[model samples]
Target: ARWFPKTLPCDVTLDVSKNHVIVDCTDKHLTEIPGGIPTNTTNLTLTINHIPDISPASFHRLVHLVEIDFRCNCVPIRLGSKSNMCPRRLQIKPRSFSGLTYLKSLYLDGNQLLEIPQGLPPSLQLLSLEANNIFSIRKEQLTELANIEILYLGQNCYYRNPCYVSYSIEKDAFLNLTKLKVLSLKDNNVTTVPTVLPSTLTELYLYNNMIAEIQEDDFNNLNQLQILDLSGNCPRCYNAPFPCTPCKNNSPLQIPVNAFDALTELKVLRLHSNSLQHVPPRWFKNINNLQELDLSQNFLAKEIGDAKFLHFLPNLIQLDLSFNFELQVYRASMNLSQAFSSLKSLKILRIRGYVFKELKSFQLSPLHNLQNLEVLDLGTNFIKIANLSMFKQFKRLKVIDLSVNKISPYDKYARSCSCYKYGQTLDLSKNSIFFIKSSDFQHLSFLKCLNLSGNLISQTLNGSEFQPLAELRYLDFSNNRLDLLHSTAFEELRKLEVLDISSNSHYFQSEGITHMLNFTKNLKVLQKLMMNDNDISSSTSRTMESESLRTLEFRGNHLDVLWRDGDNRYLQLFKNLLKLEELDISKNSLSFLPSGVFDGMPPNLKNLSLAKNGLKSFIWEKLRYLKNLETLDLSHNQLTTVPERLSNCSRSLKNLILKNNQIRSLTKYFLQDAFQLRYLDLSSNKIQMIQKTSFPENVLNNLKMLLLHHNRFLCTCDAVWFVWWVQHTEVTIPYLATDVTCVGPGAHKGQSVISLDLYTCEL
Candidate 1:
C-alpha cells in the first residue's frame, strides 16, 4: 500500500447486499472489490482503498446502486505482482435481478477500472464517481446507462493514452441518455475525438487531454458540448476525419477528408494542444453556435483573408489563438475587409504569434466588420510599425494585446490611433520599444488588463501615456528593466484588479507616502499584484508593504527578506487582501514563506507556489495557514518528501506538478488524502516505476490529462493503458500515441506509432 508497490487484485466480494448499501464512504480505508459488488446495491461505498481495475463491468451488479463517494483515495493500486490474480471468469449476472429491478441510481467509484461494465441499469438519474483510476471506457458499456443524468469524474486516469480508437464501442452510447446534464472529465490521456457524446451534454471537460488533430466528423456529435475545458494541453491542432481537411497524403499533412464542417451547438471548443503545421483556416466553417473557441497553443499555418476566414461563421463571439510561434511577417495577422461582417455576434478575438521581422501596413485591415468585437489580442508578434486611425472602426473594442513584439514608438499604427479606444485589456509585454510617445491608445478610455512587461520603455513611464484607458483594471509592466513610473502614470485606473510593475526598481524615495502606496490606495478592486523580478530591497518591501493587492507574484526576484527593514508596521496596512487567490513568491531571496506573508490573504488564497529557496522539503505549518489552497508547485527544489498535511489537508487541489526536482519515485500515499486532483506533472524526474493500475476510474476518469512526457516510465504490457486507453473510449490522446518518436522496446529512439486514419480505422 505504500512506496507505490505494484500488486495483483483478485477475489473481491462480488455481491455486496443492495439493502445494506448506505453509500457515503468518501473517507474510508478499504480496497479490492471484484466487479464492484452487485449493482443491486442502491448506494455503493469505495473510498480510501487499494482497489484497481474496475471497467464498466464494475457497475454490472449494481443495477440498483446509486450515489458514489469519490472523495478520497486519489492514486491507484497498480497491479504488478501476479499473485493477487482475478476471478477465473467474470460473473455475468442475470440481466434482470429483482435485487436491482428498482435501481434508480449507481455509484461505481474509488477503484482502478479499465473498461466500463456492460448492461448497467439504465434507470440511473444521478452518478458521482471522482478520483478513480479509469483508462478504457467503451461506449457499448453505456447502453445500460441511458438514463444517467449528472456524471462527475473530475480527476481520473483517462489521460494515459488519447489516440485513435475503434468504432466497436456502442455507436449509440448516448442514444437514450437524454437525462444527462453535467459531464466532467478533466485531466486525462485523451485525444482525437468528440463524437457520440450526448448532444445534451451541458458542462463538458475534455481538458488536459493529449488532443492534437480534430476532423470535422469527429466534432459532429457535440451539438451541445458547453462550458468546456481545453486548458493545460499546450500544442494544439483540433483534428477530425481526413480528406475533410487540406492535409497532404504522403507528408505530415492534416489528413482531412472534408475540413468544411461544423459543430453547430458547440459553445466552447478548448483546442490548446496539437502539432498544427499548416492552419487551413475555415475549419470552423459552419459552426453557428460556437461562443468561445480557444484555439491557443496551435501553430499559425498561414495568413488568411477575412472573406475566406469568416466564410460561414456568423455567430462566433470569442476566438483565441494565442502562443503559436510562427509569424515570419506581420502580414500573417488577420487582415481583411468584411471578413468578420457575418460575425455581428463576434465579441472577443485573441491571436498571438511571434516573428523577428518588422511589420507592414494594413496589418489589421480584415477586422473592420467586427463592430461587436470587444477583445483583440496580437501579442508576442513583433511589429515595427506605428500608425493610428486605421482602427477607428473598432468603436466597441475592449482588450488589446501587443506583447513580445518589436512595436515601434513612432510608427503609423503606433500614432494617435485612439480608434478602437472604448475598451480594456492592452498588453505590450516583452517588447523592445524605447519610448511610449506613440498614441496608438490615447483618449477613448475603458481599457483594462494592460500588460507592458519585458519592454524597453523605461523612459515612457511619465504621466499621460495611459490617460486614455481610464477604466483600466488589470495592469502588468513586469519583466521590463524599468526604474520609475511617473506618479501620474496610473492615476485613473480605479477598478484595477491586477497591477504588475515588478521588474522596475526606482531608487528615488518620496516623503510620508511612498511611490507605490499612492497607486495602491485608489485601487479598490486591485486583487493581484505581480511585483517580482526586480531589485527592491527589504527597505523597499517595507516602503511598499501597505499595498492592498491580494495575490502578489514575487517570483524570480532574489529578495532576502520582504521587510528586513523591520517595519512590521508595513504588515498592518497590507493585511487587508483577504480575497487573494494565487500567491507565488518562489525563487525569491528568502528561505521561507515569510512569517505572515499570507496573513491578510488566507481567506481567498487558493494556490501558493514557493519552490526552490535553498531549503529542502515543504513547511506545512507555514503553508497550512491558507485554507483554500488547491495547487502547490514545488518543483526544482531539494525536497525529499512532500509535507504530511499534503495528504491530510483534504484540500480541493486538482493539479500537482512536481517535475525536475530531486525526488525518487512516489508512494501510493504520496498524495495522502487530497483526492480531487485531476492532473499530476511528473516528467524529467528520477522516478521510474509506477504501481500497476496505480490509477483507476476515480483517478483516471477525472484525469483527462496526464503528462508523463520525458519520463522513464517503462513501456510494459501491463501499462496497456497507454494503448487501449483512448482506443476503447470516446476519448483521444493524439500526442501520447502519435508517431512522435519513442524509446521503448522494439523501437529506436525515433520510433513512433503510426495511427490508422479514421477512414481506415473504421474498417
Candidate 2:
C-alpha cells in the first residue's frame, strides 16, 4: 500500500478517540490519499496539497465528519501534467462529501470551484465558497441550505475575465433558508436587490454591486431585516481606471413610496456614491429608529432646508450629506434656520462642500435646536459667520469645524457680541481670522483641542485673553506672525497636553526659554511642546520644572548652544525633565558642547540628533553621565578621534553615527563595553591605521552593519592586520576599495586595501 515516496501525508495526529482524527497536510506534494485510512475520521484538513481530483466516495461511510477545509495549494511543477492542472482550477467530483451527514462547516475558498457542488449535508450551519467561478445561482442549489446561518459568495465566478460579468440570482433562490442570519454577495455585478430574502435575516451586504433601483415591495415581509444597502456605483472624476460608468440614465436611484415602510428596527443606512436627488417626501417615515445615515457623494440638488420629508426622522444620531455639489447656486442665498429643526436626537452632523456661499449678515441660526449635538462639521465651505450669538444655544457642542472658510470678526458686531458656550474641539484653520479678543469666547470653559493654524493672526496673546480657559488641553497657533509672547500668555491653561507653535514670524529677541516658562502657572501637566523655525537663540533661561513633559521639538532655530557656556543654564533648566524622552535640536549652528552641559538630566533621554551642525569635537568628560542613550547622531562634524570615554555609558548605546568627521584614530578600549551596539558608522574619516587589537573581539563579531568606507588606510606591512580583517570580517563595508586604499609604500600608492599582497607581511 506504500505507493508514494513518503509514508505519511504531512503531519497527522489522532485524538483520544481513534475515529476523531486530525490531518495537517499543508504545503506538501501529496498526490493521493494514503492507504489504511480510518473510516470514522470526523475532521479533515488537506490544505496546500497537490491532490488534483477526488472521487465521490473519498470520505465513504465517515458520517461523523463535522468540518473540512481545502485552501491555499500551489500549482504543481511536475514533469507530466494534464488539463485542469492549475491550483486555481481544482476539480472536485459531485457528492464527494455525501457521507458526512453531520458536517456543520466547510471552507472551499481560494480554489477554482466552478459550481455550487450538490450533495452538501443538511446539518451545515456555515459555508464559504468564495473566490470561485460559479457565475450564476439556481433556486434548487440553495434550497438544501435552509438551516445554514452564514453564507459567503463574494468575488467568485469571474476568472479569466478582467471585467465584471453580469450575474443573476433566481427570484426564489433563498426561499427555504428560514434560519439564515447573514448573507454576503459583495463585489459582483448584481442589478437589483434580490426579492427572495428570508424573513429571519438580520444583516445583508451587497456593497460594490451595481444595484440600480428598489421597488416598493422589494423588501416586503422582512420585518426582522435590519440593514439594506442599494448604493449604485459610478466613476469618481473625469478619468477612471476601472470598469466604472454613470448611473443608469444619469438619474437618481429610483425609490418608490415607502420602499422601507416597515423597517422599524433598522439602525444604520448607507447610500453614498449614488446619484440620488433630494430626499423624497416622507420616504423614511417607517424607519424612525435609524441611528446613522450616510448620504455623501450624491446629487442632492438645491436647498434641503425645511424639507417636509426630513421632518420625520427624529432619532437619527449621525448624518453625513457632504459632496452634494448641486447646491452651488441655492446655498449662496438659502436660509438654513429650519434645516434640521426636527432632528432632536442628532449628535453629529457633517454638511461639508460648497454648501454655504454667502454670509451677508449671517448667523448660525439654522442649527438652533441642535443642543444635543456633539460634533458639527461645516468645513470646506465658504461661510462667514458675523454674529457670535448664533451659537448661544449650543451648550453641549464639543467639536466645531470651520476650516477652509472666510470667517472674521468685524467691529460692527462687537457691541452686541453675545458669548456662546462650546467647551472643546474647535478648528478654525485656513481662514481670515485676526485679532481675537477675550470677548469672542467669554463663555467657553474646559476647552481641549483648538486649532488656529493658517490664519492672519499677528499680535501676540493679550495675556488676559485665555485666562478663563483653565482646562485647555490642546492648542495650535502655527503659521502666524507672533513675535513677542507676553510673559503671561498661557497663564491659566493648566491641563494642556499638546502644543504646537511652529513657523511663527518672530525672533523672540533670541529668548525662547522665557516663552516656555510662561506656562508654569497652569500648564504643569503639559507633555509635548513644539517651537520649530521661531528664530530662537540659546541665551534664554527657564524657571519652570518640566517633570511631566515627554518631548521638546525646537529644530530650525539658529541657537549656537541650547544653553550659555559660562553658566550651567541647561543643567538648571533640564534638571527637572525627568520624564522627557525625545529632544531634537538638529539643523542649527554650533561649534562645541561645553563640558557638563548635559549633566543633571533625566535618565530616559534616548534620541539625540546634532547633524548639519558645525561641531568640531566632543570632549568625553562632557557626556559621561548619560547611561540610557541609545541613538547618537554626530555626523557632518569636523575633526577627530572617536569621542572619548565612551565606555562610561556604553551598555545601552545601540546606534552610533560619526560619519563625515575628521576622526584620524580609534582609541583602544573606547568601545570595550559597547557590546549591545548593532550599527556603527565611521565612514569618510581620517583613519590611516589600526592596531589589530584595537577592535575588541566582543565588538567586532556582534555588529550587524559597520561602515568603514572613505577612510585613509595605509596598505603596507605596517597595516597587515587591517587588510586581513577587512577581507575576512563578515560585517558589510560598501565601496571598500574606492576610498579604503593605500596611502603609503611607494610600490602600492593607490592600491585597494583588499587587492594589496599583504601575505608577505604575514611573517
Candidate 3:
C-alpha cells in the first residue's frame, strides 16, 4: 500500500503505477546522488535540489537510465547586496554521463554552468541547456554530441545591460554533425550569420541575436535547411559589434547578391524584427522552392511599392509585412495592383501595425487583390472607413483582423457578404462602431469567432441580430457601452460556448444580473459566461441556470449582502449547472455569506475565488464538503482565523491562497490533512509562528510553490525547521534570501532566514 518502494534510496521515491520505474527526488536538498538506486530505474527527476557537482561515477550502475532532469539547481549565488554579479556555478566532471549508453535525453536548463558539459553519452538525441550561463559555442564543446538531433541553447548569456549578451561561435562549429536536424540559439549575442552548418539540418533558430549581415556562403552547405528564424537581430548600426547604435547614416543589412541562391530546399525564412531596407530580388531569384517568407518589422518602404519587388518568388504562399510604419506613407495613394500580382499562390498576408491615414477605397488594391488569399490582417491601422473596394478581391478570405481602427459599421456596404462569405473569424475590437443591425452578420453563417470588445457599441441586443451565425462559438462584447438585452438575445447562437460581455458601465442596476438569464437560457452549448466589473446587486428578477456551463465569472459586483432576508431571490442560480467547474466572485465588496449560499452550486466545482472582499466570516463547513474543489483564493479579506473547514478537503485541493489577511499563527490542524496541496500562498499576514507540526515531514512531498514573503516571522529555535525548509526549497519561494526576512529575537531581526547565524537564536 506504500507509495514508494521498500528498498528505495533515502533521497528518492518511486511511482510504481507507471514505469519506466519513475523516480522523483525534487526538493530533497541532496548534496549528491545517493547510492543503490533501483537498478531498473528508467527515469530520474531531481529538480530544485542543491547538487552543485555531477560526479563521474554518478550513474555508472544504472544501465537502464534513459533521462535525468536537473532543472532549477546550481542557482547563482549573488556576490553582494548591491552588485549584480553572480559568482557561484555548477560543475560537471569529465565523463560524468559517459557510461549511460541508453540515455536518450538530458535537461540542464535554469542552471549556472559557464560551459557546455563534457563527456555526455552518445545516445542522447535531445539536449536542452536553456537559461544557463554558457556564453559561447566552439567546435570542441559539442564534439561528443554527434548523435544529438535536437539541441536547445537559448538565453545562456549572464551579461547584463540592454538585455544584450554576446556570444562567440567558431565558424566551423557544427561541421560534420550530419545527424543534427534542429538547433536553437535564440536570445544570444552572436554578430554574424553562422557558417558551416550541417548539410542535414532542417531547422535553425538564431533569433534575438546581434546578427548584422549575411555572407554569400553562410548557408551554402545547409542544402536541407527548411526552416530558418533570423528575427529580432540588428542588421546595421553605427558601430560594428556590441554597443552598436542605430543611426540614419547606417545602412541596413545588405544581403550578398547570391545569399539565398543555393538554398534549393528552403521552405520558410523569417526575417522579421530586423533593420532591413531593401530585399534585392536577385537574392531569392533562384529559390523557387520557397513557400513562406516573413519580412515584418523591417524597413522595407519604397522597395515594396515597386512592381518587381517580389516578382521572383513565383510560388510563395505566405508573406508577413507587419510593423512597416513607413510603408503606409510611401504608398498612401500608390496603386499596388501590379506589385503583388505575380504571387498567385499566396494564401495568408499580414500588413498590420502601419499607421496610415484614412483608407480611401482601393488603398489596398494590390494587397487584398490576391484571389486565393484566405487570411489577411490589417489591424492597428488608421482607417476611418471600411468600404467594399478595399476588400473587393478577397473572394476567398476566411479571416481578417481590422481591430484598433475608426471603422463604424460591421458591414457598411454589405460587402463582406460575398467577399468574405466563408470567413471563420472577424476581429473588430478597439473600434468606434456604435451599433449593429440584424443584417450585419446575416451572411456570416460560418463565422466561429467574433471580437467586438472595446468598441463604442451602445445598442441593446435582440436574439434576432445574431440569428445567422449558426456556427459561432466565441463572442466577446466586453468593455462596451451596452445596456439592455432581449431575453432571447442569444437564442440563435446554437453553438455558442464562450461569451464575455463584462466591463459595461451602463449595466449598474440589480436587473442587470437578471437580464443575462434571458439570453443565456437559449444558448444550450454555452460553457463560459463572464460578467465581471458590472455593478450587479444581490437580487435579480429571475434565476440563472445552465447545464453545460463550466465557468461563471461574476466578480467586482456590488453584492454586499446575499440571502440576508431569508428570501430565495437568487436561489435559482446554478441549480441546473451541474457541469460548472470554475467560479470567481472576487472584488465584490461582500460583507457576509450565508451557510447555504454555495450549496446550490455544482458538485464538480474545482476553482473558486472570493478575494479582495471585506468578508469577516464564511460558511467553511459547506465549502469543505466540496471534495472536488482544487483551488481556493481568499486573500485580502478580514479573516482572523485559519478556518478549520479547509483542512478537511485534503483529497482534491491543490492550491490555496490566504495572503494579506489578519491571521496570526498556524497551528497543527491548519494543514494536517492537506497532503495533496501543491501551492500555498500566505504572504503579508499579521504574524506567522508556523508550528513545526503544522507542516509535517511528508507535507513537502507534493508541494511546489510556497509563498511566505512579508510575514513578520519570528527568529528562534521554534522556527529553525521552517528556515531550513526555506533554504532547501528556495527555488519555489519568491523573494527568499533577498527581501523576506525575520523580524524577531533581537540580534537576528532584519536578517534573511538563510543567512542567519544559528547562535543568535539557539540560546
Candidate 4:
C-alpha cells in the first residue's frame, strides 16, 4: 500500500488501517500553521515550533482533527542581550478552535498562555495545559468544555518557568464540566482546594501545592472519586533540589476528620511527603472500599502503632508507610501485629527507613493472617538480623524487599530451616554480609530473582551455594568484594537469563574474562551479562561461546589493554556469541579501533555503543561485515569529520549519533547512499557550514530527524541554503529556535540561524 500522501508534506504519513492521517510538524522552525493539510487528517502535532499565534481560521478546513498538539509553541522567546525582555509567545484568538467540531484532545503544555484558550470545542475529552504561565482560571474560561473528561493544569506556578504571582481558580471554574473524570492542579501554588469541583471527578491530583488546610466540604460532592493525591503540600524539605519551604510553623497540611468522608468510592489515597504526624482513624470509616494508601516520607512514627485506622479498611491491598523518620537517630522497633491484624486482604506492605533494628516473628505475627499478602518491603530499616523463618509465615508471599539493611545472612547464627515454597524474588542488596554459604539460599528453592549487590561477600563461591535455586532467573552480585568463581558455581542455574557481576574484584586480582566465561558457560539460557568495572585487563585466547547471550555490558573496565600494541586478543573476545545483538563497551579509554576487530562478533549484532572513547577516526569499511547493524553510537569521541565511506558502511543503519565530537565540516557526499538513515545527531561539533550539497535529496527525503545544534554555524551566504532548508524541510530539527544559533559574522552572532533573512543571497 502507498502510505505516503502526495498532497501532504513528506513527513506526514497515513494510517489507513485506523482510517486516520497524521500530520506531524514538530520542530520545523515554523512561525505559522502550514497550508494544504488534508481534510481527513485526524491528528496534527505542531510542538516545539515558533508559531506565535493561533488565529480563528487556523483549523477551519480540517474538521476531522481528533487530536491537536501545539505544545511548547507559546514559550517566551528571548532576543539579543535582553534577559528580562520576552519577545513573543503564542496568542490564541477568541474562536481559534471553534470550527474543529471533532477535536477530542488538545495539548497546550509548556507554553506561555496566561489563560485557557477561548472558544474550545465542547467535543474535547482531554485538555492539557501544564507547565504554562496561567495565573488564574475563571468560570467562563472552562464553561464550553462540558464534555471534557480529563483536564491537566499542573505546573502552572512554581514549576518550570514559574509564574511569580499566586495562582487562583474561581469558585465554579470546573462546575460546568459534568463529564470531567480527572482533574490535575499539582504544583500550582494553590492556597486552598478549588471550590465547587465537578461531582463526576474520579481522580484529583492536587499534590505539591501550598494548600494549608482542607475543609470538610472540600470533597463533599465527589462520591465517584477513586483516587486523591494531596502529597508534597507540607513537605519535609531536606536536601531538596529546588527551593522548598515547609508549611507555616512547620505544621502538616491540616485536614478535618471528615474531609474525605464523602468519597465513598475512594480506592487510592496518596498523602506522602506531607509532614503528617498523625492520621485520624475516622478518615477511612466511610470509605470502606479504599484499597491503596501511600503515606510515606512523613513524620508518622507515632501513627504506625496507633493505626486503629486499619480496622475500617478491610479491603486495603497496598499500603506504603516508608521513610516516616530519620534512619540514623530513631531506634524504635515497631510492633505491627496488633495494628495490621484487621487488614485481612492486604497484599503489599512497605515500611522502609523506620530504623527498626530487628525483624522478629512477634513483631509481624499479625501479618500471618493476611494470607493474600504477596509482597513485603522492609528496606532501609537498619535491620541487623533476619532469620529466613521470619518470612516463612507468608504462604503467598512472592517478593521480599530487604535491601539497604545491615543484615548479615551469611552468618552462622542467621541460618534457619524451613523452605519458602512461594517466594519468587528476594532483594537483600546493600548489606554487610561477607560470605554466602550453601545453606543461605537452601530454603528459597522457588526464588527466581535474587539481589545480593553492594555487599561484602568477598569469599569465593565453591559451587554449591546456589544449587537449590534451580528456578532462579536473575542474579545481581554487582559492587561486591568477591574475587573468584568456580566453574560449577552457577551450574544449577540453567534458567538464569540475566547476571550482573559488575564492580566486583576491585580488591583482588584474578583472571577476569576466563573466570567469568567458565562460571557462566553452564547457564544455557543466560541472555544478558553485565561485567562492567571489574578491572579486566587480560583477554581469553580460546573461544567461549554462549549462543543465548544477546546483550553484554562490559563498560568502565580496563579492557583497553587488550587492544594495545602486538595483542590481537580483543578480536576474539566475542567470537562465539552467535546470538549477541547488543554490546556496550564504552568508557574504556580506547584511542583506536583496529580493523577486523568486529570480525568475531555475531552477524546478528544490531546495536553497538562505543561512546566516551578517545578515537580520532574510525575504520568505516569494518562495519560492512555486520550487515544487519541498525544503530551505532560513537559520540564523545575526537573525530574531525564523518567519512564519505560511511554511506556504504551498512544499508540497515538507521540511527547514527556523533555528538560531542571535533568534526568541522560535512562533505557533499558524506551521506550520499545512506538510504535507511532516519536520525542523525551531530550536535556539539565544530561544523561551520552546511551547503546545499551537504545532504543529497535522496538522503534528506528519507531522514526523519536531523540534529545540528550546538555547533559553530557561520551565518553567511554559504549557509543560506541550509537555513532555508531548515525552515522548509519536513524533517524535524528539535530545538530549532533555541539551540540552533549562529556563532560568527558580526550581526548574526548569537542569533537563531532560522531567523536569518537570505533574500540578498538568493539574488
Candidate 5:
C-alpha cells in the first residue's frame, strides 16, 4: 500500500491457505481497493496500506483459518470535530472475519473498525482492536462472546468521554461470561463497564476511562479473580450531596457490611485514581486472600477508626495509600490499635505524603505485631511532633520517609527521636526541626539512612542530635534554614556514605567547596555529595579536607569569587580534590581556571555539570583535556556556539545539554563528528527554525530528549509539525500554571501562554 495522496486506486494481491494466508502491500496511492481480498486467510499481514474500505464478505472463503491481522492499513484514527474526543466508529467499512470457524487469534486492530464485528469465530481466544473508531459496547454485543478470554480494545475513541470503562453500573456487562479471564478496554468510552461486560472477568484493564464507581456489587461474579487493574479511572466515591446519599456516613467506597464481604478471592486489586475518603470496613470482610491493595491518589482525609477500617483482609501483604488531598495527619486513637491487628501478613505498608496536625492519638503496642512491615514512606506530612515511642512496635522497618513536616520545638517534641534503635532507615526530613538542646537522638542506634531535606533545621541541631545513627548510609538535609555547619554539627555519623546538604542556610564562610569538603571528615564512607544551592565561593574559601569522593553535585549554588591581593585563592582547592569521580561546579563565578583546575581528579569522572556560569568559553585550552568523560551539562550559560576544542575530546560523552543560553544556530561541524551523543537539551533560547543541514539524519537518529520544547517556533502552517512534535513527543513542562508564560506575535500584546495553557498544549 502506497501513501502520499492521489486520486486513483492501485493493484493488490493476496495469498491464502487452508490454515493461513498473508498480504504484503504498503504506500499504495489508491482511493479504494482495485480488487477486494478475503478475510478468511487464517494468517494475514496487510499493514501500512491506505485502503479506504473492505467488505465484510472477505472471511467467507477461508472459513477454517486460524489467524488474521490488518494493522496500519491507513493513516491511523482521524481527529473528530472536537479537539480531544474521537469518532465512535469507522466512517467507512472495515475488513471482517465472519465465518472463520477454526480461527484462534484474530486481529483487525488499529484498522478503524467501529463495532465488535457482527460475526466472529467462536474458538477465538485472543483479539486486539485498539486505536480505532469505537464508541460503546452494548449488552447484545457482549452477550455473544463466551470463549473470548483476552480482548484488547484500549486507546480508542470511547475513552474520551465522561463515563470510563473500568467502573460498571451493574446493568449487565460481564454478568454472563463465566470463563472470561482477562479483558482490556483501556482508554475507551464504554464507561462504567458498559453495564454488559462481565462480572466473572478476572484481569480487567480499564484505565484512562474516567470511571467513577466500584462497589461491593461491582465484582459480584469475579470470584476467581487474581488481579484487577482499575487504575487511572476516575472512581468518584459516590458522594451524594452533603447529607442525602444513602450510607453517606459510611465509607464512600466500602460495602455496607463488616469487611471485604463481597470480594473473597481477589489477590491484587488496584483501586487507585478514585475519590475514596476512608478505608471501608466491609472491604476487609471478604478479602481473605488479597495480596496487594493500592488506594492511592484519592481524597481520603477523615480520621480513621481503629479496627473499623482495618479489621478485614487478614491476608493482606502489601498496601499503598498515598497522595490523597485531605490527608494532613496520622492520628491513631485506641480504636486504631484494634484495626491493624488483622493484617498479620503485611510486609509493606506505605501511608506516605499525608500531613498530620496535632497527632496525639493511638498506642504503639496495638500495631506492634506488624513485624514484617518493611517500607514505610511517610513523606510530605505536616507533622509537628509525635511520640517516637510508638514506633518501638515495628522491628523490621527498613525505609522511613518523613519529609516536609513541621516539628516545632515544644517541650519534649524535639526529644521524641531519642533512645531507640530503628532498624535501617529514619527520614525526619523537611521539617521545622531547628534547635536541639542536648542528648537528643542518643538512642537511635541502627539507623542507616536519614533524609532531612527542605526543612528549617539549622546547625542548632548539634552533633549529639545525629551521633546515634552510626551506620547511616544516606543523609539528606537540604533546603533548610541553616546558614552554617559548625564543627560539632557533623563530628559523628562515621558510617555515612551519601550526604545531600543542598539548598540550606548556607554560612558564607571564606572557605569554599574545600571548606565544605573538610566537614565530611566525620563521614568516612561518603560516596555521593550534593552541597548545591548554597552561597559558597571556591576562590577564597577554606580548603575542604575530605578523604575521598565519587560524585559531587554543586548545582544552582551561587559560588562567588574571593579576592585576596588580586590573586585567585580557592583555585588550588579545586585542584587538590583529585580523587573525585564526578563534580558539578555550575552557576559559579570563576574568573579563570588558573592553570590546572582539574589537574589531579580521578580518571573515572564520567558525569560533570558546569552550566549557568560566567565563563567566557572553554578557552579551548584547559577544557579539552578530559578524554574519558561520558556526560556533560553546560546549559544556561553565556556560550554562543559549540566550543571547537571540546569536540571529539571525550570518547564516551553520550549526553550533552546546551539549553537556555545565547546560542543562535547549530552547525554540522560542531556536532556531526560526534558518535556517542544520545540526548541534547537546546530549549529556552532564540532559535527561529532549522533546515536539513542543522543536524544530519545520522546524528538526529541518536537524539532521544531533543528538548527544543521551550524555544520560539514561527507559529504558522509550517510550524504545525514542530508544534505537533512537542505534542506527540509527550514532553511536559516542569512549571505550574502560575510559573512560566509565553509571548509571541500571534498572542496578545505582550501576551503570554501561561503554563496552564501548556497543560492542553493550546495557544
Candidate 6:
C-alpha cells in the first residue's frame, strides 16, 4: 500500500474511502512533467505551470488517470507585454493521450494552442479548451468523443484574445456528441447556431456571440434542455465600453416565434441584452416548467404593458425585466396588474431602471397574489411618489430595494399606513428625502437592515422618527446633509449593531460634538461606527466611550490638533472601547504623533490603517501596548527606512503594508523578529538592492506572500540572488514577471529581473 515515489515535488494524497491517489503540481514553475508520478494516480493537476510541451509518453505511465487539469501552462498575454514578445505555446504531440483508457475529464484552458489537440482519449466525458487561440471547430476533430457529456470552448474569440479572423464551425460539428449534456460556446464570434446539435444537451450557453437571427428549428430537438443563455448577442450598445454593433437595421435578434416551442423541460431562459422589442406568448406555451426568465436590457417598455406572454409562465419563480427603456424615451408609469396576475409562484422580481413616474397602491395590486415573493427590486426608476401601502400585502417579502429614486418622504403621500413586520432589509438610498417625520419609518418594525444613505435629510431628528424600528440591526446614513442630531435620535435602537454616518455635513463639527456623543450613548449593542469626512478635531470637554464597539472609521478628519504640545485630553478618545479590534484614521494630513497618542487606545485592536498621511517618521515602540494587533497599513507615507523598532509589536503582526513609501534598503534586523508575519507588501518603493541577509531563510519560509514589485532594482550581480529567490521561492509574488523589471545597468533597462543574463556575472 505504499506510494510509488517518496521524493516527488508535488503533493500526493490518498483518498482511503475511494481508494484513489491524487497528485497536485500547481504553480511549481515546472518546464515538463515530473517523471516519478505514482502509476495509480487517479487525478493529476498541473495548473499554472510553465510546461511548454507534452510528449506522447508524458502521461503514458499513469494509465489510471481519470482526470487531468493542465490549464494556464503557456505564457499569458498580459497588459503592457509586447505583442511581438513571442512567448512559448503549449504543444502536445499527436497521440499524446491516445492510450489513456480511463481518462474522463481533460482541461486545457488558458493556453496558446491554435487548434484542439489531436488524438485525445475517446474515454473523455468532459473536455475544456477555453481561452485559447482556436479559430475553428470541425466535425472530424470531435468524431471520437462520442461519449463526451460536457464541452467548454468559450473565450477563444473573446475581446481579450481578439482573433481578428472570423470564427468558423463546420456543419454538424457537434452532431456526433450524442451524450453531451452541457455545451458552452459563449464569447465566441459565431454568427449562427451550429447546425445539427445533439438532442441530449441539457444546458447550452451561446451568450455574447454575434448571432443575429434564429430559425424556428434552431432548438427543434432539444427537448431535454433545462437552461439556455443567448444574451449579449445583439446587445444594447448605448454607453457600452467595448466595441459593439447593434443588430442590422437596429432590429432585435430575429426569432421566428416557434424557436423554443419544443423545449418543454426548459427551466431557465436568459435572453437579456438582445435588444428584443416584444416577447411572443407562444414562446413559453410549452415551457411550463420554466422557473427563471431574464429579458432585461431590451426595448420592451411598450410591449411590457401588453405583457400577455407572462400568462403562459405560471410556474416562474424569478424574473428580471430591468433597463428596457432608452435614455428618456419610455419614462412612464407601468400598468403590470394584468401582466403579473398569473405569476403566483414568483419569488424574486427585478424591474430596475424602468423610469417610472410614480408608484401607487392600485398599480401594484396584482402582486398581492404572489405570496411566495421574497425579493423586489425597483431601483433607478426615477419614481417621485411612493405609496408604502403597496407592499403591505407581501407578508413573505424579505428584501425591498427602491434605491436611486426621487421619492421624498417629507411629502404627505409618501407615508406608510401601518407596520410592515415581514421585511428585514430595505434600501431607499439616493432619494430626495429632505427631512424625516415620525411617520417616515413607522411601518418598519421588524426591519434588520435599513439604508438611507445619499439623501437630502438636513433637519435634526425629533427622537421619534425611527422609534418604531426597534428590531433594526444595521442602519446607514452616509452622504447626507445632516447639520445636527438630537440627543435622543437613536434612543430606541437598542439592538442596532452597525451605524454608518460618514460624509455628512461638516458644519456640525464646531458645536455638535455633544449631540453626536449623546446620540451614540443609547446604542448599547453597536459594534461598528463609521464617521469619516466630518473634519473632527480635539475636544477638551469630554470623550466618547463605547465598550461594545469593535470597529471605528474616522478617516479624513482634521485631527492634527489632538497631537498639539499642550493638549492631551483627546488622547483618551478611545480609552473605553475595550472590545475594539479595528480602526482606520487615514487621510488626516498628520505629520507627527506623540509617543502617548495611543496610550488610552483599545488594547485588543488587531487592524490599524494610518495610510494617506504625511508621516515621515514613526516610533514603532509606541504600538507595543496593542498586543493583539495583526495588520498595520503604513502605505502612502514618506518613510525612508524600515522601522527598526517594529520588533516591539512583531509577535502578533501578520500583515504589514508599506507600499508607496521611500524606503531605500532593508536591514537584516528589520524582520528578524517577525515570526508570525505572513504577508508583507513593499511595492512602489525606492529600494535598489536586496542582499542575502536582508530576509532570513526562516522568515522567508514562514511568509505566504511577499510583494516587492515596482521597486528600483539594479540589474547587475547585486540582484542575482534576489532574482534566483523569486524564481525558486514558494511564496507567491503576483505579477512578478511583468512588474518586477530592472531599472539600471543601461543595457538591461526595463527587462524582467528574472531574465537577467547572469552567465557573464558568474565567477
Alpha-carbon local distance difference test for all models? 0.51, 0.66, 0.71, 0.78, 0.55, 0.78
The candidate that wins on TM-score is 6
Assess every candidate by TM-score. 0.49, 0.63, 0.69, 0.76, 0.63, 0.78
Off by over 4 Å in 1: 1-49, 52-65, 69-115, 125-159, 162-167, 170-303, 306-311, 320-334, 354-362, 386-395, 408-423, 438-449, 456-474, 484-499, 503-535, 538-763
TM-score: the better of candidates 1 and 3: 3
Model 6 lDDT tens row, 1-763: 1222133557667987986899888766667787778898998998876686888789878899999988777634641224323267788898899889999999888777899888887789999887788989998888878889999888778666678776799988998898999998887788899878899999998888889999887899999999999998888888877777788887888888889888999999999899998899988888989999989889888777788899899899999999887676645576674778799899999989788788877777677778888788989888998865355565457888888999997011111101123236778899888887657677667678888899857866656677778788888888886644455666688888888888874554665354454356667898898888876664433456776889999888866776666667677777677788998988877777766777877878999988987787866776777788888998998877676645655568888999998888888677775677888999999998887765766777878888888998877777766767656566666655667788878888887765555777776
**Candidate 3 residues 118-215, lDDT tens each?**
88888998888866777778988778988899888876642321224568787788776769999887766766766788888888988766676778
User: What would you estimate as the lDDT of candidate 4?
Assistant: 0.78
